[PDB]
Design a protein around this ligand. Structure first.
Ligand SMILES: *[C@@H]1O[C@H](CO)[C@@H](O)[C@H](O)[C@H]1NC(C)=O
Ligand SMILES: [Cu+2]
Length: 227
C-alpha cells in the first residue's frame, strides 16, 4: 500500500494527490496529479483491469495543473515508503491529451510504454525487483521523457504492481498514479497506443505468477516498450 506524495521536475516540487488528506477536505488544492477515491492506499486487482479504475486508479479524475518538462528531462516520483513484501515491476506510459489534460476523457487515452523494469535478480527467491530498486532509491523513481515523441500535453501513468499475492487469480495489485506533463523539444513520433482497459489481463504471465519459487524469466506485463 502507498501512493506518490510528490513530483520533482527541473528543481521544484509539484505536490502530489495526497489521497489520505485531500478526499477529507472538499476544497482541496489544484495539483498536476489526478485525484483518486483510493483512500485505503490500496490497488486495482485483476477484477478491475477492464474497468475505468485501471486507467489512473479508482474513481480517478484529471489533475487541474500541468508541469512542463525540459526536452529529455527527468520526472522524479516520490512514494510513501514501499513495503519490501510488495515485490514487482515498475512500469511507465504516456498518453497524449491532444489539448488540456485537465478536461480529457480518461476512457479514451491510448498509452505507449516509455520504460519498464521487472525482476532484477533471483539469487534469493522471491528476488530483487524494480520495486526493491525503488525502495533502495529512498522510495523515488526517475522517468526520462523521450526526445523522439511529438511534444504537447500527456498523462504520465506511473505504476508499481505488487506480486506477493499474485499466485491466485486476481491476486496481483496494480498501483497506477497519473500526472499531467507538457512535453517539449523537437520530436515527431506518435507511438501506437493501448487503451487503459487493454493494458493487462488477469492471466498475463507476469500477473498470474508465484514469485516465491525460482524464476528463469519474468514477462513484464502490458504492451511493448516504445523506442
Ligand atoms: C535514505 O535516506 C535516509 C536518510 O534520510 C538513510 O538513513 C537511508 O538509509 C537512505 N537510503 C537507503 C537506500 O536506505
Ligand atoms: Cu499493500
Amino acid at each position: 500500500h502507498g501512493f506518490v506524495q510528490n513530483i520533482v521536475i527541473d528543481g521544484k516540487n509539484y505536490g502530489g494527490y495526497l489521497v489520505n488528506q485531500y478526499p477529507y477536505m472538499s476544497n482541496p488544492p489544484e495539483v498536476i496529479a489526478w485525484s483518486t477515491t483510493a483512500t485505503d492506499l490500496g490497488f486495482v486487482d485483476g477484477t478491475g483491469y477492464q474497468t475505468p479504475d485501471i486507467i489512473c486508479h479508482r474513481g480517478a479524475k484529471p489533475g487541474a495543473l500541468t508541469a512542463p518538462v525540459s526536452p529529455g528531462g527527468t520526472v522524479e516520483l516520490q512514494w510513501t515508503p514501499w513495503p519490501d513484501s510488495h515485490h514487482g515491476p515498475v512500469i511507465n506510459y504516456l498518453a497524449p491529451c491532444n489539448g488540456d489534460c485537465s478536461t480529457v476523457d480518461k476512457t479514451q487515452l491510448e498509452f505507449f510504454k516509455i520504460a519498464e523494469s521487472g525482476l532484477i535478480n533471483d539469487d534469493n527467491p522471491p528476488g530483487i525487483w524494480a520495486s526493491d530498486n525503488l525502495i533502495a532509491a529512498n522510495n523515488s523513481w526517475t522517468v526520462t521523457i523521450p526526445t523522439t515523441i511529438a511534444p504537447g500535453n500527456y498523462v504520465l501513468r506511473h505504476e508499481i504492481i505488487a506480486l506477493h499475492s499474485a499466485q491466485n487469480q486476481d491476486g496481483a495489485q496494480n498501483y497506477p498514479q497519473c500526472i499531467n506533463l507538457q512535453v517539449t523539444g523537437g520530436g515527431s513520433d506518435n507511438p501506437a497506443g493501448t487503451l487503459g482497459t487493454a493494458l493487462y489481463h488477469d492471466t498475463d504471465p507476469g500477473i498470474l505468477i508465484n514469485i516465491y519459487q525460482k524464476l528463469s524469466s519474468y514477462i513484464i506485463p502490458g504492451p511493448p516498450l516504445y523506442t
